[PDB]
Design an enzyme around this catalytic site. Structure first.
Site, PDB file in Angstrom:
ATOM      1  N   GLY A  72     -18.229  14.873  -9.529  1.00  0.00           N
ATOM      2  CA  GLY A  72     -17.289  15.231 -10.808  1.00  0.00           C
ATOM      3  C   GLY A  72     -15.943  14.713 -10.534  1.00  0.00           C
ATOM      4  O   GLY A  72     -15.723  13.719  -9.585  1.00  0.00           O
ATOM      5  N   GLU A  73     -15.090  14.702 -11.738  1.00  0.00           N
ATOM      6  CA  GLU A  73     -13.815  14.139 -10.907  1.00  0.00           C
ATOM      7  C   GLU A  73     -13.319  14.387  -9.652  1.00  0.00           C
ATOM      8  O   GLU A  73     -12.152  13.797  -9.539  1.00  0.00           O
ATOM      9  CB  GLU A  73     -12.544  15.419 -11.967  1.00  0.00           C
ATOM     10  N   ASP A  89     -11.936  25.829  -2.230  1.00  0.00           N
ATOM     11  CA  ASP A  89     -11.609  24.689  -3.498  1.00  0.00           C
ATOM     12  C   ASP A  89     -10.358  25.365  -3.579  1.00  0.00           C
ATOM     13  O   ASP A  89      -9.908  26.170  -5.032  1.00  0.00           O
ATOM     14  CB  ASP A  89     -12.250  25.116  -4.632  1.00  0.00           C
ATOM     15  N   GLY A 112     -22.887  17.579  -4.152  1.00  0.00           N
ATOM     16  CA  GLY A 112     -21.616  18.100  -5.398  1.00  0.00           C
ATOM     17  C   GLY A 112     -20.781  16.280  -6.144  1.00  0.00           C
ATOM     18  O   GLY A 112     -20.682  15.459  -5.189  1.00  0.00           O
ATOM     19  N   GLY A 150     -14.778  13.592  -6.673  1.00  0.00           N
ATOM     20  CA  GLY A 150     -15.221  13.048  -5.844  1.00  0.00           C
ATOM     21  C   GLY A 150     -16.880  13.314  -5.805  1.00  0.00           C
ATOM     22  O   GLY A 150     -18.048  13.645  -6.453  1.00  0.00           O
ATOM     23  N   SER A 151     -16.632  13.094  -4.442  1.00  0.00           N
ATOM     24  CA  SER A 151     -18.127  13.457  -4.582  1.00  0.00           C
ATOM     25  C   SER A 151     -18.505  14.424  -3.056  1.00  0.00           C
ATOM     26  O   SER A 151     -16.919  14.231  -2.738  1.00  0.00           O
ATOM     27  CB  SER A 151     -19.192  11.694  -3.868  1.00  0.00           C
ATOM     28  N   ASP A 204      -7.582  29.967  -8.887  1.00  0.00           N
ATOM     29  CA  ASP A 204      -8.794  29.418  -9.255  1.00  0.00           C
ATOM     30  C   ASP A 204      -9.520  29.482  -9.085  1.00  0.00           C
ATOM     31  O   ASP A 204     -10.946  29.357  -9.065  1.00  0.00           O
ATOM     32  CB  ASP A 204      -9.067  27.501  -9.673  1.00  0.00           C
ATOM     33  N   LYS A 217     -16.253  16.010   0.948  1.00  0.00           N
ATOM     34  CA  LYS A 217     -15.600  15.581   0.709  1.00  0.00           C
ATOM     35  C   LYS A 217     -14.725  14.910   0.527  1.00  0.00           C
ATOM     36  O   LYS A 217     -13.957  14.202   1.110  1.00  0.00           O
ATOM     37  CB  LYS A 217     -14.645  16.813  -0.594  1.00  0.00           C
TER      38      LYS A 217
HETATM   39  C1  LIG Z   1     -15.512  20.186   0.947  1.00  0.00           C
HETATM   40  C2  LIG Z   1     -15.869  20.496  -0.596  1.00  0.00           C
HETATM   41  C3  LIG Z   1     -15.003  22.038  -1.355  1.00  0.00           C
HETATM   42  N1  LIG Z   1     -16.641  22.679  -0.714  1.00  0.00           N
HETATM   43  C4  LIG Z   1     -16.822  23.469   0.057  1.00  0.00           C
HETATM   44  O1  LIG Z   1     -15.962  23.500   0.828  1.00  0.00           O
HETATM   45  C5  LIG Z   1     -18.082  23.878   0.578  1.00  0.00           C
HETATM   46  C6  LIG Z   1     -18.550  24.743   1.505  1.00  0.00           C
HETATM   47  N2  LIG Z   1     -20.221  25.220   0.962  1.00  0.00           N
HETATM   48  C7  LIG Z   1     -20.771  24.212  -0.110  1.00  0.00           C
HETATM   49  N3  LIG Z   1     -22.121  23.993   0.202  1.00  0.00           N
HETATM   50  C8  LIG Z   1     -22.892  24.064  -1.038  1.00  0.00           C
HETATM   51  C9  LIG Z   1     -22.736  23.272  -1.692  1.00  0.00           C
HETATM   52  C10 LIG Z   1     -23.763  22.204  -3.213  1.00  0.00           C
HETATM   53  C11 LIG Z   1     -24.708  22.404  -2.789  1.00  0.00           C
HETATM   54  N4  LIG Z   1     -25.526  22.610  -3.624  1.00  0.00           N
HETATM   55  C12 LIG Z   1     -27.643  21.615  -2.707  1.00  0.00           C
HETATM   56  C13 LIG Z   1     -28.961  21.759  -3.833  1.00  0.00           C
HETATM   57  N5  LIG Z   1     -27.694  21.079  -5.116  1.00  0.00           N
HETATM   58  C14 LIG Z   1     -29.067  19.947  -6.242  1.00  0.00           C
HETATM   59  C15 LIG Z   1     -27.159  22.099  -6.147  1.00  0.00           C
HETATM   60  C16 LIG Z   1     -25.849  21.740  -4.322  1.00  0.00           C
HETATM   61  C17 LIG Z   1     -25.613  22.942  -1.414  1.00  0.00           C
HETATM   62  C18 LIG Z   1     -24.557  23.641  -0.255  1.00  0.00           C
HETATM   63  N6  LIG Z   1     -19.961  23.390  -0.540  1.00  0.00           N
HETATM   64  C19 LIG Z   1     -19.157  23.063  -0.771  1.00  0.00           C
HETATM   65  N7  LIG Z   1     -18.212  22.186  -1.446  1.00  0.00           N
HETATM   66  C20 LIG Z   1     -18.096  21.851  -2.250  1.00  0.00           C
HETATM   67  C21 LIG Z   1     -19.784  21.030  -2.830  1.00  0.00           C
HETATM   68  C22 LIG Z   1     -20.507  20.483  -3.960  1.00  0.00           C
HETATM   69  C23 LIG Z   1     -19.071  20.685  -5.245  1.00  0.00           C
HETATM   70  C24 LIG Z   1     -17.919  21.427  -4.691  1.00  0.00           C
HETATM   71  C25 LIG Z   1     -16.683  21.362  -5.768  1.00  0.00           C
HETATM   72  C26 LIG Z   1     -15.786  20.563  -5.249  1.00  0.00           C
HETATM   73  O2  LIG Z   1     -16.268  22.511  -6.183  1.00  0.00           O
HETATM   74  N8  LIG Z   1     -18.141  21.947  -3.716  1.00  0.00           N
END
Ligand SMILES: C=CCn1c(=O)c2cnc(Nc3ccc(N4CCN(C)CC4)cc3)nc2n1-c1cccc([C@H](C)O)n1
Ligand SMILES: [Cl-]
Length: 259
Positions: free
Chosen positions: A16-17, A151, A14, A19-20, A134, A36
């Site tokens: 966006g605003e 989040d 991920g 970060g990463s 949210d 994050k």
């Molecule tokens: C730690 C921060 C927040 N956060 C979690 O707590 C958290 C828990 N699980 C996951 N699992 C997860 C998410 C996305 C993907 N993808 C795999 C293929 N990609 C091309 C598309 C996406 C695979 C697995 N992601 C999470 N977070 C997260 C990831 C991204 C963006 C954001 C924003 C801040 O909302 N948050």
């Protein structure tokens, strides 16, 4: 660097605003985490407030199966790092987009399971005298199926709440009106519109006429065949009177969702 030391970076999942976010494996335990990484917010700023809401949410909540587990948070090189559970299914938002493309769908049964599961998470948050503020698809994560709320940067106390308004698309009118006497019911409103998105609704309005039309208690047009009883339920979840919307606890114990 603790980040480099403790973890090996696998994939950016991920950006966006905020970060990463990176899929990382932790060296010691061989488990996967979502970390994050962001610039440390300017002191006094909204970003700092949001970050503090998140820290002190973790301090209170501990651990629940419909909430994304928080493990640790530190700062280094003027960055902050938050280490969470990795949900291998991505967000409900990604899954909805994928549905809109391959082309599959969430039918009634699946929608009801989503309502119940996120509802359980809300139930727990509310019982700790907190509100999420949210709720939306991009903040609901999937493990494979388990739905979990993440989040927590808008989480605030049922009173006294420091209200940073959520996404205008999922926001209840009374919150916009600076009425914070029933904030849990704003989480309920948002959940219903979240389930409406999963059911295949067109993009939700950010403002203007159809926006107001929804807060008048009218469900956005859906593309499929839902029961009058599931519909009524979603309808009362966006009732203009937040006191008429069910609490989380009333929601998880409802005949329509049970099982
Ligand atoms: C730690 C921060 C927040 N956060 C979690 O707590 C958290 C828990 N699980 C996951 N699992 C997860 C998410 C996305 C993907 N993808 C795999 C293929 N990609 C091309 C598309 C996406 C695979 C697995 N992601 C999470 N977070 C997260 C990831 C991204 C963006 C954001 C924003 C801040 O909302 N948050
Ligand atoms: Cl309430």
């Amino acid at each position: 660097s603790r980040y480099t030391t403790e973890f090996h970076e696998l994939e950016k999942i991920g950006s966006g605003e905020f970060g990463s976010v990176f899929k990382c494996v932790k060296r010691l335990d061989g488990c996967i985490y979502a970390i994050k990484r962001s610039k440390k917010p300017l002191a006094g700023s909204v970003d700092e407030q949001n970050a503090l809401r998140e820290v002190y949410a973790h301090a209170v909540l501990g651990q629940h199966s419909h909430v994304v587990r928080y493990f640790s948070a530190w700062a280094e090189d003027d960055h902050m790092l938050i280490q969470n559970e990795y949900c291998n299914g991505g967000s409900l938002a990604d899954a909805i987009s994928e549905n809109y493309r391959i082309m599959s769908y969430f039918k009634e049964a699946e929608l009801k399971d989503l309502l119940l599961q996120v509802g359980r998470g809300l139930r727990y948050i509310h019982s700790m005298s907190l509100v999420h503020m949210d709720i939306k698809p991009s903040n609901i994560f999937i493990s494979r199926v388990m739905f979990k709320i993440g989040d927590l940067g808008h989480v605030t106390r049922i009173s006294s709440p420091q209200v940073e308004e959520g996404d205008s698309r999922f926001l209840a009118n009374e919150v916009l009106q600076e009425n914070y006497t029933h904030l849990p019911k704003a989480d309920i409103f948002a959940l219903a519109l979240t389930v409406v998105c999963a059911a295949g609704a067109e993009p939700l309005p950010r403002n203007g006429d159809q926006w107001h039309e929804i807060r008048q208690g009218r469900l956005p047009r859906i593309p499929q065949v839902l029961s009058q009883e599931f519909t009524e339920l979603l309808k009362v979840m966006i009732h203009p009177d937040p006191e008429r919307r069910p609490s989380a606890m009333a929601l998880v114990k409802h005949s329509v969702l049970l099982s």
